[PDB]
């Protein structure tokens, strides 16, 4: 929301997913990863735009299930 | 752990072997490791008293929030010694971290005199520490 | 003669005052605690006077031992 | 210390001996992906046959446990080989004991269980394979779970297993989200491309290895050549 | 050894490090009501892909006990496992008592294989426990290495401190109806985070008629109008 | 770098009563009378000049050349003529010293003044007054005598004897041609120890001493734990042939353990060295190094043979009647009571040492000075049985 | 007491009533309390909307 | 240093059995005090929280036989299995014998299996400190006092708990021998009850204590319930006030 809805995101973006991780991604990786999503080889941001940097910085440290 | 500083334990224990014996000096150590068999040295400089601190008690507690709070400004009424015993234990030092909750919950406020209410919410200091979970396993 | 400035002798930063870069409640980090903070801030913001009287004895030194968190 | 090399409880309050397992399933080279649908439930792994000197007829991850119930195995071979002659063994038990067939979800209860005691005590060790099991039961219609190293026994409508599996994953709930249920054309089709899009690779029908059950038809259809190709062939349309 | 160890003077090290892990991150709060008591848990599954009427977090033992649980969910179904087994022992043993407050406190008595047995590695596990064939409700809760608290209201979770703090705020009480599973719905909602559902929150209420895993159906209803 | 110290002080310690008395008050009084008499001689002398002879030819001839700038530096070698000196900020110096040339008292390795410009060394400064990497003659020879310890006449007879062997009749054994440096290996509890060394100072009234107790595993990777003590005995020999009491360490430092390799490397140094040094075939001299410990059972089997470390004496603990001397040599200084309630303390007593003996006579007078206070307090009968049982002697929960 | 809801609600109506009579500072404070105490609720559709 | 169960000391000490004896002293708070004609124990209340029931109706204070019980000052996890052991030896003993079991008898059977725990195997000591009080035909009334040593003792004004030094030290000061009966002994256990645990004015909830007593041929174990605690608690109260205003 600092950068305005990252600058008109679209709708089809949730951070229900990058988020709910478990993976530390400190504020300032947050503040990166914000300002990283930022491929935008057309007019506005997208989630096709997103997906280069959405895919990218995947969540390594997984395995919650056998304590749940 | 006969590394270098027990080397300067050593030199330290012979150091004052000498001086002190050869004088207007004394040494007073302090220990809150609980007890003295994890550190029992050499018994000279330390045979002369082992004086222990009994954490304070209730009444105890009451005197060192009087000594704390003769400074502060408060409230006309207080009952002081309720608001010891409700604090578990504890020390000196919580009782000056009550006594600083408390001006600081009264700080908010921007008022001459510290409430009960807000005298309670300094023995809120004394919790937040508590058992953490019920382990009860004594 | 004798400098009145102090701090560009050896820069190492310098007035930060006077600019809004981030402003308060705007932080993403809400509290962690940020009421200790509050608490630090409170003798710049004056209290001083409230630190006399009622007898507190404000905090002076505060250290934050945590990760780029 | 030995935290982290017995099967005993973390200071910070873990389990890391699991936490490994869980990651020797990814050990291995291979994925696996489970989908069920609208009547039936379909898996389909990769078949991994390094040079041709080796029996393609008998490489497969993919066995019957009993004429209902089909499991596809991810990790260390030896493992899961070991893993399914349990389940044929407890299905076969169970059959013996009670009369009616073994419904998958309690088979692979079974399966949890003795993991858990694997991981419980420390003479043993867990074993680091990841099983899939599906087939049809009455009054529930398709049934897909997974049996992992540590006991924890889930899964339903889409789930994958193996080195790229949250993209698996992802990709499944994607089309789970988009609200339409699977046919017995649609099911197979999705496993394939899910499968596909992880490894693009357009999936040549001899290095894949599906298994089916439906509710019509019972039984672990193991698919051959002609019923893959002729699948791929209708998804490539 | 092959038991409950790894104790050094004055200390359960390991037991403590089990009671860390059982610290887990599943609230399921438990409150003790006149009528009868509710067994309330969160199941927030990763993705869609997983199901909800597939496995259980509330398991009834007997016909009036059920049970509620906290990390370490493999063990916990040994551990259920095991306690069905010996109410049904016990119920076979001393024939037709429909034993379960009489037997509340026996069946959380026995589990001591539970953790006094622990087997190498003690159980991560506490459990919440519940019966009503006495008149009267019982809850107890069973942690990883002690026995019976009697526990009124309690949460074993990640917000589980919180979760105490704000069961006794809104005051358990004692003249609290059997539909106090709102307030444990409220708690559960103060360690919840996202919009809770019918397949998202899993409740068993155990009165004097018995136990009984409230379905989706009326999960949802109770979740209405709050 | 050190050799002596002036030992202009300790006036006369033999004052006998050393309690207020006339004759001690004579005694100080003849004592305070030949300071002034000394002070009156020396400045007396001092200003009654024999004769006034020019500058004392001092201003006249060097203290002009000397200069008044100087700078302070050490001095390293000494050639025939020259003198090569090592200055401050690492100069270095090749000239002759010609004026206030002192050439016992330069020596290599002490501080020499520069004149500055033509910087030629005019001078010494023998104090310097920094001899400070390791320090362990500080306490030499303590005035501790015979006196201070008694009921221990057999061990002190015995003790006296191994170190007698040399000094007094240095040719008896000289004749037998064996030189023995074998030393005294100390046994006794371990409520005891500084009675080995109140044992010691009995030979410490002849020559000086040397104390290495706790030191270190020698974990140092050059060792010279038992080697830099050869070294410092060897500085022994050159002063007056002193001792080295090394108790705790010979049985700690010097430990009879089963394990053979992987032991810290003090088994294979410090044990090895410790029998070269104490074997007479490799070092001369007249040091005698007195092993003291409170374990027997840990003697090294090295440490063991009296062959080369012989004299062993054991130190046993003391009997009704040294009980008695020992309370009242500590509570002589004190005046305990005029009632002398001396065997009450002692008669049913068993296993109390030297340091519980020095403790309860402390603790003794603490009490009374509590709030007891006074002088001979009459409570000091039966509070003098009151703190010493002063429980501290032992304690472990129960079992039993 | 610990509700969350209710609080919400009243630091927002608290915030908006000062707006009303033009009390910026303490609408912007109440306001901060108002997201402080928002941010237990984390899908409360129709609230988030009312913060924002 | 400390190792597997079954080890010594370079001296010749069992240091992990001293450490749990001493780790006894830690948590919990038992005494037990010996009277003519009534044999009684106080335990401490540890956790007093708001949110239990108290429908166990015993914590500390165990019934094991109809002529005993016991207090435990252990961890509850031991402590759980040894009085059930300690239940069953009882009554074993009652089937083979037809008669209850002597007091004395019991605890030698008890303080043998925490000796077997810590003699042999590597099996942890039993770290639970616990009392007993009971009748017999032979001795009448009697007081054990049991360490996770094995090593019992015959005791009749004894404390296990955290301030067992204060409080066996306070009831040394005020313990009268003969002179004492059931009304004195309740008197001075609560005492020194009130003396250990720091805040004044216990309540009878904190407290929880349980007297023997020999009716006509017949043990009763009469534990006092809250409102007999707190009668116990307000005649202390004015004896507390009546001694501090007649100075
Ligand atoms: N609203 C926000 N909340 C939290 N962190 C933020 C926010 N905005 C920016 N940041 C990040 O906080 C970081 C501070 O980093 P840094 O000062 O290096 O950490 P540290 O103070 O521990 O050395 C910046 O890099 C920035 O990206
Ligand atoms: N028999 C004795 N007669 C006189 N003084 C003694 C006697 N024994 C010990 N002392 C004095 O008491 C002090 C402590 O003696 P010792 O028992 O050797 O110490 P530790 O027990 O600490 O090794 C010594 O400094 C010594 O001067």
Not at chain 4, 37 to 58: E, R
Request: hydrophobic share 35%.
């Amino acid at each position: 929301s600092k950068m305005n809805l990252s600058e008109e995101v679209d709708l089809e973006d949730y951070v229900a997913r990058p988020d709910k991780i478990s993976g530390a991604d400190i504020n300032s990786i947050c503040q990166e990863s914000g300002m990283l999503a930022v491929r935008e080889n057309r007019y506005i941001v997208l989630a096709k735009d997103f997906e280069k940097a959405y895919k990218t910085v995947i969540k390594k440290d997984e395995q919650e299930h056998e304590f749940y | 752990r006969l590394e270098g500083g027990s080397g300067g334990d050593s030199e330290v224990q012979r150091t004052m072997l000498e001086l002190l014996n050869q004088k207007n000096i004394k040494v007073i150590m302090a220990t809150n490791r609980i007890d003295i068999l994890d550190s029992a040295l050499l018994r000279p400089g330390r045979i002369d008293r082992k004086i222990e601190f009994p954490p304070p008690n209730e009444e105890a507690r009451l005197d060192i929030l009087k000594i704390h709070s003769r400074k502060m400004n408060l409230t006309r009424g207080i009952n002081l010694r309720k608001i010891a015993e409700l604090m578990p234990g504890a020390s000196g030092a919580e009782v000056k971290g009550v006594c600083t909750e408390a001006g600081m919950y009264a700080l908010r406020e921007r008022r001459v005199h510290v409430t009960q209410e807000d005298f309670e919410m300094a023995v809120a200091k004394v919790m937040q520490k508590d058992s953490e979970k019920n382990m009860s396993i004594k | 003669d004798v400098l009145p400035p102090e701090a560009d002798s050896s820069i190492m930063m310098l007035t930060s005052d006077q600019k809004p870069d981030v402003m308060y409640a705007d932080i993403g980090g809400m509290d962690i605690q940020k009421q200790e903070v509050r608490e630090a801030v409170e003798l710049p913001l004056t209290h001083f006077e409230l630190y006399k009287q009622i007898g507190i004895d404000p905090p002076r030194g505060v250290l934050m031992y945590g990760p780029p968190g | 210390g030995f935290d982290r090399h017995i099967t005993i409880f973390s200071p910070e309050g873990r389990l890391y001996q699991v936490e490994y397992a869980f990651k020797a399933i990814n050990q291995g080279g291979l994925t696996s992906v489970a989908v069920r649908g609208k009547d039936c439930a379909v898996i389909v792994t990769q078949k991994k046959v390094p040079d041709k000197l080796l029996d393609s007829s008998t490489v497969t991850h993919l066995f019957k446990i009993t004429e209902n119930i089909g499991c596809v195995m991810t990790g260390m071979t030896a493992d899961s080989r070991s893993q399914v002659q349990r389940a044929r063994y407890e299905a076969a038990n169970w059959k013996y004991k009670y009369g009616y067939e073994i419904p998958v979800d309690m088979l692979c209860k079974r399966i949890a269980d003795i993991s858990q005691v694997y991981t419980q005590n420390a003479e043993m060790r867990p074993l680091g394979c990841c099983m899939i099991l599906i087939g049809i039961d009455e009054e529930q219609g398709p049934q897909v779970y997974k049996c992992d190293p540590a006991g924890y026994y889930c899964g339903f409508k889409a789930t994958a297993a193996g080195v790229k599996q949250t993209e698996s994953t992802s990709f499944l709930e994607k089309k789970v989200k988009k609200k339409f249920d699977w046919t017995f054309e649609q099911t197979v089709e999705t496993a394939i491309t899910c499968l596909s899009t992880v490894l693009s690779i357009d999936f040549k029908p001899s290095e894949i290895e599906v298994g089916v059950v439906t509710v019509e038809n019972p039984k672990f259809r193991i698919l051959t050549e002609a019923e893959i190709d002729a699948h791929l062939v209708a998804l490539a349309e | 050894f092959s038991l409950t160890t790894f104790s050094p003077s004055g200390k359960l090290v390991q037991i403590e490090y089990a009671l860390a892990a059982v610290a887990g991150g599943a609230p399921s709060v438990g409150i003790k009501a006149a009528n009868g008591v509710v067994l309330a848990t969160e199941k927030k599954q990763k993705s869609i892909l997983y199901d909800e009427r597939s496995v259980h977090k509330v398991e009834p033992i007997t016909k009036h006990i059920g049970l509620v649980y906290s990390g370490m969910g493999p063990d916990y179904r040994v551990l259920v496992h095991r306690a069905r087994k010996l109410a049904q022992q016990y119920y076979l043993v001393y024939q037709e008592p429909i034993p379960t407050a009489q037997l509340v406190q026996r069946v959380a008595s026995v589990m001591q294989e539970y953790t006094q047995s622990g087997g190498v590695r003690p159980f991560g596990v506490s459990l919440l426990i519940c019966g009503w064939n006495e008149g009267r409700p019982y809850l107890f809760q069973s942690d990883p290495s002690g026995a019976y608290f009697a526990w009124k209201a309690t949460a074993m979770g990640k917000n589980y401190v919180n979760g105490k703090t704000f069961l006794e705020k809104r005051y358990n009480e004692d003249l609290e109806l059997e539909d106090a599973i709102h307030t444990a719905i409220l708690t559960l909602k103060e360690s919840f985070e996202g919009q809770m559902t019918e397949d998202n929150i899993e409740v068993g209420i155990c009165n004097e008629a018995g136990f009984r895993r409230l379905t989706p159906t009326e999960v949802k209803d109770y979740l209405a109008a709050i | 770098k050190k050799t002596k110290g002036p030992d202009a002080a300790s006036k006369l310690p033999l004052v006998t009563p050393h309690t207020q008395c006339r004759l001690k008050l004579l005694k100080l009084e003849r004592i305070k009378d030949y300071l002034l008499m000394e002070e009156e001689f020396i400045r007396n002398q001092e200003q009654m000049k024999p004769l006034e002879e020019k500058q004392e030819e001092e201003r006249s001839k060097v203290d002009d050349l000397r200069g008044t700038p100087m700078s302070v530096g050490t001095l390293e070698e000494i050639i025939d003529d020259h003198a090569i000196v090592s200055t401050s900020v690492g100069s270095e110096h090749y000239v002759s010293i010609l004026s206030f040339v002192d050439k016992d008292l330069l020596e290599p390795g002490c501080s020499v003044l520069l004149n500055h410009k033509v910087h030629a060394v005019i001078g010494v400064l023998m104090d310097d007054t920094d001899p400070l990497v390791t320090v362990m003659k500080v306490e030499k020879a303590p005035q501790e005598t015979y006196a201070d310890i008694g009921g221990l006449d057999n061990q002190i007879q015995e003790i006296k004897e191994s170190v007698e062997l040399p000094l007094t009749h240095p040719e008896y054994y000289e004749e037998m041609g064996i030189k023995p440096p074998k030393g005294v290996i100390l046994y006794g509890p371990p409520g005891t120890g500084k009675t080995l060394l109140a044992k010691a100072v009995a030979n410490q009234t002849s020559a000086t001493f040397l104390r290495v107790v706790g030191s270190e595993l020698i974990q140092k990777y050059l060792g010279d734990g038992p080697k830099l003590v050869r070294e410092l005995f060897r500085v022994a020999e050159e002063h007056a042939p002193s001792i080295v009491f090394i108790d705790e360490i010979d049985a700690i430092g010097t430990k009879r353990y089963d394990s053979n390799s992987g032991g810290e490397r003090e088994i294979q140094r410090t044990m090895l060295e410790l029998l070269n040094q104490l074997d007479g075939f490799d070092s001369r001299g007249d040091v005698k190094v007195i092993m003291a410990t409170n374990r027997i059972e840990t003697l090294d089997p090295a440490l063991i043979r009296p062959g080369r470390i012989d004299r062993k004496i054991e130190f046993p603990l003391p009997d009704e009647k040294t009980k008695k001397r020992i309370f009242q040599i500590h509570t002589s200084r004190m005046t305990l009571a005029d009632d002398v309630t001396l065997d009450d303390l002692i008669m049913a007593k068993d296993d109390l040492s030297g340091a519980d003996i020095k403790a309860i006579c402390t603790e003794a007078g603490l009490m009374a000075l509590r709030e007891r206070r006074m002088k001979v307090t009459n409570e000091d009968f039966k509070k003098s049985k009151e703190n010493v049982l002063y429980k501290k002697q032992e304690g472990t929960p129960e079992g039993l | 007491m610990d509700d969350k809801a209710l609080l919400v609600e009243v630091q927002l109506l608290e915030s908006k009533t000062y707006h009303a009579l033009s009390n910026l500072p303490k609408a912007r404070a109440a306001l901060t309390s108002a997201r402080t105490t928002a941010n237990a609720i984390y899908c409360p559709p129709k609230l988030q909307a009312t913060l924002d | 240093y400390d190792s597997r169960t079954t080890i010594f000391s370079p001296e010749g000490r069992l240091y992990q059995v001293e450490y749990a004896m001493e780790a006894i002293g830690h948590a919990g708070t038992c005494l037990g005090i010996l009277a003519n004609d009534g044999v009684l124990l106080a335990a401490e209340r540890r956790n007093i929280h708001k949110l239990l029931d108290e429908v166990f109706f015993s914590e500390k204070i165990y019934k094991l036989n109809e002529d005993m019980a016991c207090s435990v000052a252990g961890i509850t996890s031991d402590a759980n299995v040894l009085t059930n052991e300690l239940r069953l030896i009882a009554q074993r003993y009652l089937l083979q014998y037809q008669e209850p079991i002597p007091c004395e008898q019991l605890v030698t059977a008890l303080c043998d299996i925490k000796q077997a725990y810590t003699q042999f195997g590597g099996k942890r000591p039993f770290g639970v400190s616990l009392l007993y009080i009971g009748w017999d035909k032979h001795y009448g009334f009697q007081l054990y006092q049991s360490d996770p040593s094995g090593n019992y003792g015959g005791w009749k004004a004894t404390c296990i708990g955290n301030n067992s030094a204060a409080a066996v030290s306070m009831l040394k000061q005020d313990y009268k021998e003969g002179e004492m009966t059931l009304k004195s002994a309740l008197a001075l256990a609560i005492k020194v009850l009130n003396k250990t645990m720091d805040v004044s004015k216990l309540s009878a909830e904190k407290v929880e204590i349980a007297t023997l007593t020999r009716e006509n041929g017949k043990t009763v174990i009469r534990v006092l319930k809250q409102k007999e605690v707190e009668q116990l608690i307000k005649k202390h109260e004015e004896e507390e006030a009546k001694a501090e205003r007649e100075k």
